[PDB]
Design a protein around this ligand. Structure first.
Ligand SMILES: [Cu+2]
Ligand SMILES: [Cu+2]
Ligand SMILES: [Cu+2]
Lengths: 78, 276
């Protein structure tokens, strides 16, 4: 089953997640309205394109790791 | 063609390598390697088609990708070959790899911007074009997101694994391939990407020239693995949905199979490769 949706402001950025060139996403994440590619691993961990080699437990964790990575910068859409 | 440990290059081998890489960037050819890798990163999935990553073909796929990149370098300067970075031996920020005459060092703390070396944004010679993070300068945070690079003893524990790969042939697998890739166990290749940080931590990781040196050593470790396990070979060997079997062709090239890439000596040798 899909993870729950989420919506919060994290380090000044709006991050949203919801169940739904790249893979058929089952789950979408957005940072200030720009979609961020994320992916689920077989063990249930998640990654995003800007932290792809570093599994974290949930899509919100992946979204937060992306905001951490971006250090304020806008995201470019994939 | 001999692939050499980066630590052993002469000053003018380093010079020639850097100039060839900068020419591939200037001419527009470099960025399409970045783009190809990010497309496979985003499409390779544990539950569906997977070719470049999180699958048995992770190793032949990157071997062929590096061959394509090395051939592009040689079209610019035929003397150039890809060096490799043994991150188990050259494991600190003070290694010569990260000197201003080679790859440049770590990024400053404020924004991770690399400030020295030929790939520093200030040179005007290394625009980051293919990107997800919108900033356009090379970034690194060596040792910032993970404490240490793998050690020789950790690599040996992975080389001792006998099975090439195992069902379900993905990031959950036991077996050599997934332990080398790093999704399970002590973690070799993924951890190195995280340790460099910056673009190397992302799907557009070939934006950093160290990408090639990292994968050239991952590639060497597959060769070492073969010599440790001359009785063990690529799996699976047929009929596996979503996974590239031994004699199946590989995207994006389509004209090459894992089978064609198991023996690297058809393409290059290493400066040193322990005989079994
Ligand atoms: Cu293990
Ligand atoms: Cu990699
Ligand atoms: Cu023997």
């Amino acid at each position: 089953a899909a993870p729950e949706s989420f919506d919060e402001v994290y380090k000044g950025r709006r991050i949203q997640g919801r169940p739904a060139h790249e893979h058929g996403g089952g789950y979408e994440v957005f940072v200030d309205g720009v979609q961020l590619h994320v992916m689920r691993n077989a063990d249930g961990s998640w990654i995003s394109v800007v932290s792809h080699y570093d599994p974290v437990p949930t899509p919100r964790a992946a979204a937060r790791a992306a905001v951490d990575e971006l250090q304020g910068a806008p995201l470019l859409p994939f | 063609t001999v692939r050499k440990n980066q630590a052993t290059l002469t000053a003018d081998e380093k010079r020639r390598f850097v100039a060839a890489v900068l020419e591939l960037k200037r001419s527009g050819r470099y960025d399409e390697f970045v783009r190809t890798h990010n497309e496979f990163i985003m499409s390779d999935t544990d539950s569906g088609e997977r070719t470049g990553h999180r699958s048995p073909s992770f190793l032949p796929w990157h071997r062929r990708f590096l061959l394509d990149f090395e051939q592009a370098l040689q079209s610019v300067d035929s003397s150039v070959t890809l060096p490799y970075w043994d991150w188990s031996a050259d494991r600190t920020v003070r290694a010569s790899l990260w000197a201003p005459d080679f790859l440049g060092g770590t990024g400053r703390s404020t924004d991770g911007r690399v400030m020295d070396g030929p790939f520093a944004a200030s040179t005007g010679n290394w625009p980051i074009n293919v990107r997800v993070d919108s900033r356009t300068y090379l970034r690194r945070s060596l040792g910032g997101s993970v404490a240490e690079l793998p050690t020789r003893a950790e690599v040996e524990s992975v080389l001792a694994i006998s099975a090439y790969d195992l069902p379900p042939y993905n990031s959950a697998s036991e077996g050599f391939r997934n332990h080398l890739e790093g999704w399970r166990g002590v973690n070799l290749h993924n951890r190195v990407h995280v340790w460099v940080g910056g673009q190397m931590a992302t799907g557009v990781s070939p934006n950093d020239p160290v990408f090639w040196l990292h994968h050239a050593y991952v590639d060497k470790l597959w060769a070492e693995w073969q010599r440790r396990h001359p009785d063990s070979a690529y799996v699976p060997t047929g009929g596996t949905p979503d996974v590239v079997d031994l004699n199946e062709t590989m995207k994006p090239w389509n004209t090459v199979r894992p089978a064609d890439l198991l023996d690297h000596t058809a393409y290059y040798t290493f400066d040193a490769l322990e005989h079994h």
